[PDB]
Curated annotation (Swiss-Prot):
Modified residues (Phosphoserine): S65, S141
Ubiquitin-like domain boundaries: 1-149
Protein name in the entry: Ubiquitin
(Microbial infection) ADP-ribosylthreonine modified-residue sites: T66, T142
Cellular location(s): Cytoplasm; Nucleus
Organism of origin: Homo sapiens (Human)
Residues annotated as site: Interacts with activating enzyme: R54, R72, R130, R148
TM stretches of this protein: none
Gene name for this UniProt entry: UBA52
Positions carrying ADP-ribosylglycine: G76
Length: 149
């Protein structure tokens, strides 16, 4: 019995499996071939994220089925703030946070009063009271901090 895995490079690997092989077992096989650890794997079949403890047969995964591998990451929503002198601050934020909130977080880390902070995103200077969501600031976006002293 063989199934196919569409890997993270774009390629497709073949795995020799058995109907009762768990998803956990499949993740091990992938880690052997692609060298990515099971904790990092999310396996998608026919629109369904697959569960570690269940078997191929529980999911009716038949010969020649194609599993899609997706990278799995873990961490609170973060953004970066670059300084005049190239230090990068990492911040834990939420989509609803206002720029006011973000300035309070900068004061927390670096001790700069909010009223001395100017924050820029995609060349655009941000206004407090508007949220990160309004500006389309996503996880791992980068803000630039400028100071009115
Ligand atoms: Cl086997
Ligand atoms: Zn066996
Ligand atoms: Zn917040
Ligand atoms: Zn302000
Ligand atoms: Zn990322």
């Amino acid at each position: 019995m063989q199934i196919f895995v569409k890997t993270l490079t774009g390629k497709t690997i073949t795995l020799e499996v058995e109907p009762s092989d768990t998803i956990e077992n499949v993740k091990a096989k992938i880690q052997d071939k692609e060298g990515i650890p099971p904790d990092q794997q999310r396996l998608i079949f026919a629109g369904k994220q697959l569960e570690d403890g269940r078997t191929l047969s529980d999911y009716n995964i038949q010969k020649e089925s194609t599993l899609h591998l997706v990278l799995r990451l873990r961490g609170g929503m973060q953004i970066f703030v670059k300084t005049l002198t190239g230090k990068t601050i990492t911040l834990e934020v939420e989509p609803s946070d206002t720029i006011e909130n973000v300035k309070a977080k900068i004061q927390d880390k670096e001790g700069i009063p909010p009223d001395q902070q100017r924050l820029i995103f995609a060349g655009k200077q941000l206004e407090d009271g508007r949220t990160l969501s309004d500006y389309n600031i996503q996880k791992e976006s980068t803000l630039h901090l400028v100071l009115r002293l």
